[PDB]
Amino acid sequence: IFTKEDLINLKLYVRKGLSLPTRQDEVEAYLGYKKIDVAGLEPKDIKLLFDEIHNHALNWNDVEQAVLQQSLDLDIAAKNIISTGNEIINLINQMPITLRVKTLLGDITDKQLENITSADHEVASALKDILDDMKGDINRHQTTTENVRKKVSDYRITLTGGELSSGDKVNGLEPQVKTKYDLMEKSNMRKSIKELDEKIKEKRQRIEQLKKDYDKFVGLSFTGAIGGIIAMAITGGIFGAKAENARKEKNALISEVAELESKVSSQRALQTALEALSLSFSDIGIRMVDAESALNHLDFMWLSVLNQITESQIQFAMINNALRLTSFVNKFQQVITPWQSVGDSARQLVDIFDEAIKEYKKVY
């Protein structure tokens, strides 16, 4: 069944949804960016989803109050139907069995109300009235319970996705959070960043490799001084050239590295924002999945309760003037039996609300 943790998880999801920023500049401050250049993750995209979550959270208390008040109402409705049904059965069973088996319900109602006057006329009229009132009462509880179930179902489908009772189809807030979360992961830079770090270190070692070979070749260029004048011309030309090839290649890589470190710095910036947004969407999504499970329980409970009321209503429709009174008592028992289940479930739900409210004090 729907438990107190289920109700607390709904309140926790609503509180998270209402705390989401919805103003565009606040969503941007929350994201840490004005543009990310990933489809579906731009601040306008995130705001649209936060607006939908916020509106859904705003709508919980209408459902919550309908659920709790309907449980309070069905509690005392079940109690009244069972006790009044039992009183009616007891009244009938005061008739001797030799008469009960052959007397029809119409004999103790309609056939007393067609002629002219009686005490049995008044009680027979009151018996006909209380049956009519109970029939209408059970129809009313079916109608209101169907509406509560519809509110819970629509609240659930808004979270899961699907077709609402209005016929509108909605994508589902939880699958939408999941899509964006998946886009953040398809967009991750961690491997790109690591391969760029690797190339900065490697070119930052080669820049140093022939700073030493520049110092070598320029030393080598002087080793014509052994011969003197034209041995220095040939050592100067050959090794002076190899020394500049090393310097030129060096200056291409110092420019290369400054670019690559600017690039990797921006890729790290994107990753940091992705990781932050991922964590927020994970928190939202966990709150949603717990709320969804809570609503699965609540929806199933209200479908089951509605089914019991409908069972009672169908049995009540079988009561008619031509039932022998022994058959009537058996059918009236079949009318009130489903209401034990309805009342037990309704009282259980009221008590879960009570225990969920008390949980705050027990924790703090």
Author numbering: 44 to 160, 163 to 409
Task: Recite the paper's sentences.
YaxA and PaxB crystal structures were determined using single-wavelength anomalous dispersion (SAD) on selenomethionine-derivatized proteins. Because our PaxB model could be well resolved, missing merely the N-terminal 11 residues, we will utilize these coordinates for most structural analyses throughout the manuscript. All three proteins adopt similarly elongated, α-helical folds composed of a five-helix bundle head domain and a two-helix-coiled-coil stalk, tapering to a narrow turn in the case of YaxA, while connecting to an additional α-helical domain in the case of PaxB. Reflecting their impaired membrane binding, YaxA foot domain mutants showed reduced hemolytic activity, ranging from a 10-fold decrease in potency (V264D) to undetectable activity up to 2 µM (Δ265–284). Uncharacteristic of PFTs, YaxA’s transmembrane moiety is fully solvent exposed in its monomeric state and becomes an integral part of the pore structure upon oligomerization with YaxB.
We have unraveled structures of the soluble components and the pore assembly of the YaxAB cytolysin from Y. enterocolitica. In line with our finding that the isolated YaxA and YaxB head domains form spoked oligomers in solution, the YaxB head domain in isolation was sufficient for recruitment to membrane-bound YaxA. Together, our biochemical data support a role for YaxA as the initial membrane-interacting subunit of the toxin, able to bring the lytic effector YaxB to the target cell surface. Therefore, we propose that this class of toxins defines a new structural family of α-PFTs.
